[PDB]
């Protein structure tokens, strides 16, 4: 037997065992997420132990077969993937310690609760107690309370754990010959030896910052407009030259400004492009929402959900009896098993999210036939981009009219257009400076550029300088405000939410050309265009058998992030903002703060 014949035999063995074991583990994980009980946690922990041990041993075996002696590229790719050491480089004690730190941080975040200063017998959690305050409260003091209580009760707990987390993650990353843990995270975009399609880990920083430059003016004008309208809603609390207070941005961190639309809508007289009221008036429930999403995906030629999807998915909150992890998630268990977990509410946010998660599922179904390790998105941002282009078409007023959430006698005009673009900007454009700034702070911390005694110093400086947001209360180094967000204290890389946003508009531009769309890009809906569906499927079915650069170039004819489609999307709103801000100040001073 040749080296490659042995490799083929091994990979068939590994794939069979991997499928069966991964299916079993995902069943345990589903049980825990749908039903939070100690027994279910036990089973999931043991499943995870087995999974990681399996992958360690198979990676060790796959080390035998040298890549240079392998000529089959599909085989070579699987081998390349299976040969990465990962976290196995740490000692058993150190690896156990790091696992315990991650578990502790997760438990702290999920069980974290704050109690009212007076009558401290009744307390509030993040989900839902504090989240609804941050989303709907119009009281400066109540919002500030929720923001500061959450960051003090929970962040200060995570501060020492985060400190050790940095050391141990950096040790693992450097042991795998990465510069730091941030470099290890940037590895996701790396491409090697593909004859001009290569992409280096250092290149991602340059690309992110170069595109953020072009983002900066549109964000500045959106920011100035938002600041003006926030003064109308919190009188005496906002300076017309200052940063925005961090507790008045519509959620617990200002990650999205979506919830500000009601305070910032430019033309209230025109009919509401937020279709929540229409959905409620028409008595929509989660079944209706998901059937509508299924109908959308069929209209472009894609398969509708399997019977197993409608039998096994969890589309509503089970009740007070059993708790669940209500983070919207699209599950690909293998063996033709696809599910969605979403505690679905009758809102536009959940209508668009349903479309997004079903996009994840359509991606997964498309690449099901690939080998195990290749049944993945091309990079960490490809899946998010895939879901986001679905919601792009779903949010358009033309689409809402076609499904009846706008009246049949509804007419687009430049004002409703401005409303739509502003609401889009609040989510999409608002999240970019936030996401770039958070990931940059993490990257610098991992690189060692921010000493511990300056962590909360630097972070807030960056928040003022880049995001244009200012803390209402001064925060010393007892705090860990970044860790007060799920993704930071649960060890998720965050830059994907930046790269997603650029990919999405590139995909949308391309698909709309496939649908022969005439008009501005922001009027485009791909419904009923089996051509666009086909174009997107040709990339979806790839899995990650090809590097992300080539997979992108197959749909959009570009090998990299491009920011131009995003700007073209928002160009009319940019113009309108520039005119609306002609008397306002544009920019902000890092020196103004609420407390001083």
């Amino acid at each position: 037997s040749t080296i490659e014949e042995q490799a083929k035999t091994f990979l068939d063995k590994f794939n069979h065992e991997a499928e069966d074991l991964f299916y079993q583990s995902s069943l345990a994980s589903w049980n825990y997420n749908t039903n939070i009980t100690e027994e279910n946690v036990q089973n999931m922990n043991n499943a995870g132990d087995k999974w990681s041990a399996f992958l360690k041993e198979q990676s060790t075996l796959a080390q035998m077969y040298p890549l240079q002696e392998i000529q089959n590229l599909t085989v070579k790719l699987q081998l390349q993937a299976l040969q990465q050491n990962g976290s196995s480089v740490l000692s058993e004690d150190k690896s156990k310690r790091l696992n315990t730190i991650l578990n502790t941080m997760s438990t702290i975040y999920s069980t974290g609760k704050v109690c009212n200063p007076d009558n401290p017998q009744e307390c509030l959690l993040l989900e839902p107690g504090l989240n609804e305050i941050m989303a709907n409260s119009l009281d400066y003091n109540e919002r500030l309370w929720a923001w500061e209580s959450w960051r003090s009760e929970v962040g200060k707990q995570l501060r020492p754990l985060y400190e050790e987390y940095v050391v141990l993650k950096n040790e693992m990353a450097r042991a795998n010959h990465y510069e730091d843990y941030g470099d290890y995270w940037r590895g996701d975009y790396e491409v090697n030896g593909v004859d001009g399609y290569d992409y280096s880990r250092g290149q991602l920083i340059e690309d992110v910052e170069h595109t953020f430059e072009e983002i900066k003016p549109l964000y500045e004008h959106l920011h100035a407009y938002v600041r003006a309208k926030l003064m109308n809603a919190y009188p005496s609390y906002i300076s017309p030259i200052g940063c925005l207070p961090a507790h008045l941005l519509g959620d617990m961190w200002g990650r999205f400004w979506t919830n500000l639309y009601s305070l910032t809508v430019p033309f209230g007289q025109k009919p509401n492009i937020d279709v929540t009221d229409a959905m409620v008036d028409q008595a929509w429930d989660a079944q209706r929402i998901f059937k509508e999403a299924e109908k959308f995906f069929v209209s472009v030629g894609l398969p509708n959900m399997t019977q197993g999807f409608w039998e096994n998915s969890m589309l509503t909150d089970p009740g007070n009896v059993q708790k669940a992890v209500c983070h919207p998630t699209a599950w690909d268990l293998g063996k033709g098993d696809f599910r969605i977990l979403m505690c679905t509410k009758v809102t536009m946010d959940d209508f668009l999210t349903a479309h997004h998660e079903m996009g994840h599922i359509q991606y997964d179904m498309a690449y099901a036939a690939q080998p195990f390790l290749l049944r993945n998105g091309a990079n960490e941002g490809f899946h998010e981009a895939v879901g986001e282009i679905m919601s792009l078409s779903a949010a358009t007023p033309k689409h809402l009219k076609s499904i009846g959430l706008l009246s049949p006698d509804f007419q687009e005009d430049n004002e409703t257009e401005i409303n739509f673009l502003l609401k889009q900007a609040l989510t999409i454009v608002g999240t970019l400076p936030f996401t770039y700034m958070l990931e940059k702070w993490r990257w610098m911390v991992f690189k060692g550029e921010i000493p511990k005694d300056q962590w909360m110093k630097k972070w807030w400086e960056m928040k003022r300088e880049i995001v244009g947001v200012v803390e209402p209360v001064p925060h010393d180094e007892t705090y860990c405000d970044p860790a007060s967000l799920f993704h930071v204290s649960n060890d998720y890389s965050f830059i994907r939410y930046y790269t997603r946003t650029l990919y999405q508009f590139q995909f949308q531009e391309a698909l709309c050309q496939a649908a022969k769309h005439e008009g501005p890009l922001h009027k485009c809906d791909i419904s009923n265009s089996t051509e666009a569906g086909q174009k997107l499927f040709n990339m979806l079915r790839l899995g990650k058998s090809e590097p992300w650069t080539l997979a992108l170039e197959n749909v959009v004819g570009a090998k990299n992030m491009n920011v131009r489609p995003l700007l073209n999307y928002f160009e009319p709103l940019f113009t309108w903002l520039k005119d609306q801000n002609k008397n306002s100040f544009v920019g902000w001073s890092t020196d103004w703060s609420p407390y001083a």
């Binding site: 997420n33 995870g48 999974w51 299976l82 997760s106 390790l373 649960n490 060890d491 998720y492």
Partner: peptide
């Protein structure tokens, strides 16, 4: 969350 990834087998839920 379990993952088809040798580098990142398990994500914290």
């Amino acid at each position: 969350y379990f993952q088809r990834s040798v580098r990142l087998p398990y994500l914290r839920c």
